[PDB]
Amino acid sequence: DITIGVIAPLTGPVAAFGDQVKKGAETAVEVINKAGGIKGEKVVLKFADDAGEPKQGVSAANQIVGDGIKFVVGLVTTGVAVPVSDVLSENGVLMVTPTATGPDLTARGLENVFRTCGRDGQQAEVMADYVLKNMKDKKVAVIHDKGAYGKGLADAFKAAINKGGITEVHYDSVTPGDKDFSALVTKLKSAGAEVVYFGGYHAEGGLLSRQLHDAGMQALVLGGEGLSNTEYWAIGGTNAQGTLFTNAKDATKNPAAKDAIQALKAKNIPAEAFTMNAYAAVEVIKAGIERAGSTDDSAAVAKALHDGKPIETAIGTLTYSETGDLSSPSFDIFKWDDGKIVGL
Numbered sequence: 265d266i267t268i269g270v271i272a273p274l275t276g277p278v279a280a281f282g283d284q285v286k287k288g289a290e291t292a293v294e295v296i297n298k299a300g301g302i303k304g305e306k307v308v309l310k311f312a313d314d315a316g317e318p319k320q321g322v323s324a325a326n327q328i329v330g331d332g333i334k335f336v337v338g339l340v341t342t343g344v345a346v347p348v349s350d351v352l353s354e355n356g357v358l359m360v361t362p363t364a365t366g367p368d369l370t371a372r373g374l375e376n377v378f379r380t381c382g383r384d385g386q387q388a389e390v391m392a393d394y395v396l397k398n399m400k401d402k403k404v405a406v407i408h409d410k411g412a413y414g415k416g417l418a419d420a421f422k423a424a425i426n427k428g429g430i431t432e433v434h435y436d437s438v439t440p441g442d443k444d445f446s447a448l449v450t451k452l453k454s455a456g457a458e459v460v461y462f463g464g465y466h467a468e469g470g471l472l473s474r475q476l477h478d479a480g481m482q483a484l485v486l487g488g489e490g491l492s493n494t495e496y497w498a499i500g501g502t503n504a505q506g507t508l509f510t511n512a513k514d515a516t517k518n519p520a521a522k523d524a525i526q527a528l529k530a531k532n533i534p535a536e537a538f539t540m541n542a543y544a545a546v547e548v549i550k551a552g553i554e555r556a557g558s559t560d561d562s563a564a565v566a567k568a569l570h571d572g573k574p575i576e577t578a579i580g581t582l583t584y585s586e587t588g589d590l591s592s593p594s595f596d597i598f599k600w601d602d603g604k605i606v607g608l
């Protein structure tokens with residue numbers, strides 16, 4: 265059997281992302297096995313919970329190494345991704361991230377790391393352009409969650425709007441697990457913040473959206489794809505109406521997504537971006553193995569994914585750079601409307 269390890273937060277404040285990655289990876293595996301597996305062999309998933317905690321991610325990685333598993337989909341959050349990557353890479357375990365966007369993951373010399381997603385510099389620059397074009401005159405604030413993702417992302421947005429001439433009226437952070445942001449909100453009111461970019465995840469983002477409105481403000485919340493989960497709406501309520509955030513292009517618009525959509529509909533799983541990217545990550549591993557001709561040498565599989573030939577996936581046709589990033593990444597802006605994600 266061909267074993268694929270999945271390292272993902274199944275418990276804790278970001279288990280909602282984990283759930284998406286698991287279900288995307290799961291659905292891909294069923295379809296491949298239904299379609300005859302790899303070269304005639306069953307693909308199986310083995311799961312290991314990082315709880316969204318980098319120390320526990322290392323531990324999950326270690327278990328993955330100790331089971332002799334050679335392929336991994338996961339490394340979901342940037343903070344976990346990088347420390348997991350080292351453990352995986354040292355021990356000849358190939359890895360594909362469907363969600364981690366922190367640039368450092370692919371800039372430290374690693375030859376067996378890949379993404380089915382882009383990077384923060386691009387998505388912050390996308391939202392910054394939108395801000396400069398459409399909101400040059402708004403009081404803008406920049407907030408993060410002190411996290412590897414949160415701060416990197418928010419600092420990149422800040423840089424891009426300062427370059428375009430906009431001076432933020434406030435820069436600051438909150439601590440994951442703290443739930444009272446009334447102090448920060450107090451400063452936001454008094455700075456007259458009309459727009460607040462938040463680099464972080466839903467547990468914190470939702471609370472910021474809520475507590476802004478309770479203080480009587482009508483501020484527009486902006487962020488990255490950490491605000492793409494419906495839990496952000498669950499937490500934020502109607503206050504999050506209008507929230508804009510960046511994420512990959514809607515994969516459902518491509519005909520390449522036909523097979524994945526049907527398999528998901530059949531299981532009542534929504535075709536969300538992370539879910540699709542996790543499915544495509546399994547497809548990449550399969551394509552790697554097919555081109556290499558082996559399921560035993562992960563280095564050969566890695567070299568094959570890096571050899572310049574394009575790879576067909578549910579999210580589209582991919583070609584990897586020497587760093588393991590996508591060669592043609594792109595990010596669109598979406599908005600939360602009445603609990604649903606909509607374009608434009």
Ligand SMILES: CC(C)C[C@H](N)C(=O)O
Nearest residue numbers: 341342364365413489490
């Ligand atoms: C699941 C995503 C919100 C994770 C985020 N892109 C990160 O790199 O941490």
